[PDB]
Scaffold this active site. Structure first.
Site, PDB file in Angstrom:
ATOM      1  CB  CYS A  37      -0.958   0.024   1.212  1.00 47.78           C
ATOM      2  SG  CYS A  37      -0.164   0.305   2.819  1.00 47.78           S
ATOM      3  CB  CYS A 140       8.573  10.461 -13.632  1.00 51.81           C
ATOM      4  SG  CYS A 140       8.528  12.272 -13.427  1.00 51.81           S
ATOM      5  CB  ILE A 141      10.088   5.926 -16.502  1.00 58.28           C
ATOM      6  CG1 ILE A 141      10.298   4.421 -16.516  1.00 58.28           C
ATOM      7  CG2 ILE A 141      11.280   6.655 -17.207  1.00 58.28           C
ATOM      8  CD1 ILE A 141      10.063   3.813 -17.887  1.00 58.28           C
ATOM      9  N   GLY A 153      13.382  -2.272 -16.650  1.00 64.33           N
ATOM     10  CA  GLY A 153      13.240  -0.972 -17.286  1.00 64.33           C
ATOM     11  C   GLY A 153      12.892  -1.092 -18.757  1.00 64.33           C
ATOM     12  CD  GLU A 174       7.234  16.177 -18.964  1.00 64.00           C
ATOM     13  OE1 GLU A 174       6.550  15.313 -18.369  1.00 64.00           O
ATOM     14  OE2 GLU A 174       7.084  17.408 -18.800  1.00 64.00           O
ATOM     15  CE1 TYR A 228      18.502  16.883 -42.557  1.00 62.96           C
ATOM     16  CE2 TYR A 228      19.716  18.628 -43.657  1.00 62.96           C
ATOM     17  CZ  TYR A 228      18.662  18.216 -42.866  1.00 62.96           C
ATOM     18  OH  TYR A 228      17.757  19.144 -42.381  1.00 62.96           O
TER      19      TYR A 228
END
Ligand SMILES: *N(NC(=O)c1cc(-c2ccccc2)cc(C)c1F)S(=O)(=O)c1ccccc1
Ligand SMILES: [Cl-]
Ligand code: NA
Ligand SMILES: [Zn+2]
Length: 264
Positions: A37, A140-141, A153, A174, A228
């Site tokens: 919990c 967030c991680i 992960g 993020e 490119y």
């Protein structure tokens, strides 16, 4: 003083960063956390008493993933506010850049657990804005230290993209990324993109993977696999190129058959 050590489950873990627990809790050298919990306690005796009382043996919310003994719970921050606040305070001990701990209602939390006969043991989590104007599929991680660099992960990263695929959208974590998070994303992106190329345009890969074209391009640049041309990035790859960037730890894997979930 700051909290510098926690007991959670069968682990004692040193803190990496300040986390704003209440100053009486903060002022304790070591906090004791219920692994189920996430109640935080000041004393070994209150912890031991709680362990005998607590009825929870898994996170709250919907079990949106179960394959064998690997489980993900989806927890709405509006519906389990205390639990999610406690989770954010735990996370902040290992995340430099996290700034949000109490105003958890805008977020959904995905809790990764490893199950045995006793219960579902927390490994890590990622948070996600219910509405992300910036197209971030992870806010967030965090993987708890005893589980880091062991495949958990990678599973959460892959999971976050399986949700984006189900939402028919691309997404990116993020910024700023933690030092461990950045290494992990780069490694995930590299493996996924190379596996696909070996088995395509940048836009093709983004649609297949839900990785943004930007993250695809920066990964391919680090692999020296894009040219490119008149203002556009373009993939440029050969087998010796691909197969030599792939040539080991078998991942946990997200089995989309085992994911119970529809877009919001
Ligand atoms: N290695 N990666 C991880 O364990 C991991 C750790 C974290 C993290 C933990 C604590 C504080 C800040 C960040 C974050 C992420 C996203 C992460 F993946 S691994 O799981 O074995 C792996 C990941 C990706 C590719 C290969 C292996
Ligand atoms: Cl430790
Ligand atoms: Na005593
Ligand atoms: Zn408890």
């Amino acid at each position: 003083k700051y909290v510098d050590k926690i007991h959670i489950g069968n682990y004692e873990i040193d803190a990496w960063y300040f986390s704003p627990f209440p100053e009486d809790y903060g002022k304790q050298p070591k906090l004791w956390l219920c692994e189920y919990c996430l109640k935080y306690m000041k004393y070994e005796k209150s912890y031991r008493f709680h362990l005998g009382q607590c009825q929870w043996r898994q996170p709250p919310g919907k079990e949106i993933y179960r394959k064998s003994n690997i489980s993900v719970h989806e927890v709405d921050g509006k519906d389990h506010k205390i639990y999610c606040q406690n989770l954010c305070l735990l996370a902040k001990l290992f995340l430099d850049h996290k700034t949000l701990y109490f105003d958890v209602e805008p977020f959904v939390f995905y809790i990764l657990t490893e199950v045995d006969r006793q219960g579902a043991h927390i490994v890590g989590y990622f948070s996600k804005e219910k509405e992300s104007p910036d197209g971030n599929n992870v806010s967030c991680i965090m993987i708890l230290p005893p589980y880091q660099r062991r495949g958990y992960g990678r599973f959460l990263i892959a999971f976050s993209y399986e949700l984006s695929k189900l939402e028919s959208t691309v997404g990116s974590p993020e910024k700023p990324l933690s030092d461990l998070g950045k290494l992990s994303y780069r490694s995930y992106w590299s493996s996924v993109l190379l596996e696909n190329l070996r088995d395509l345009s940048i836009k093709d890969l983004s649609q297949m993977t839900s990785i943004t074209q930007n993250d695809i391009i920066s990964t391919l640049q680090s692999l020296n696999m894009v040219k490119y041309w008149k203002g556009q990035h373009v993939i440029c790859v050969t087998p010796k190129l691909v197969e030599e960037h792939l040539k080991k730890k078998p991942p946990i894997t997200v089995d989309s058959v085992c994911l119970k979930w529809a877009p919001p």
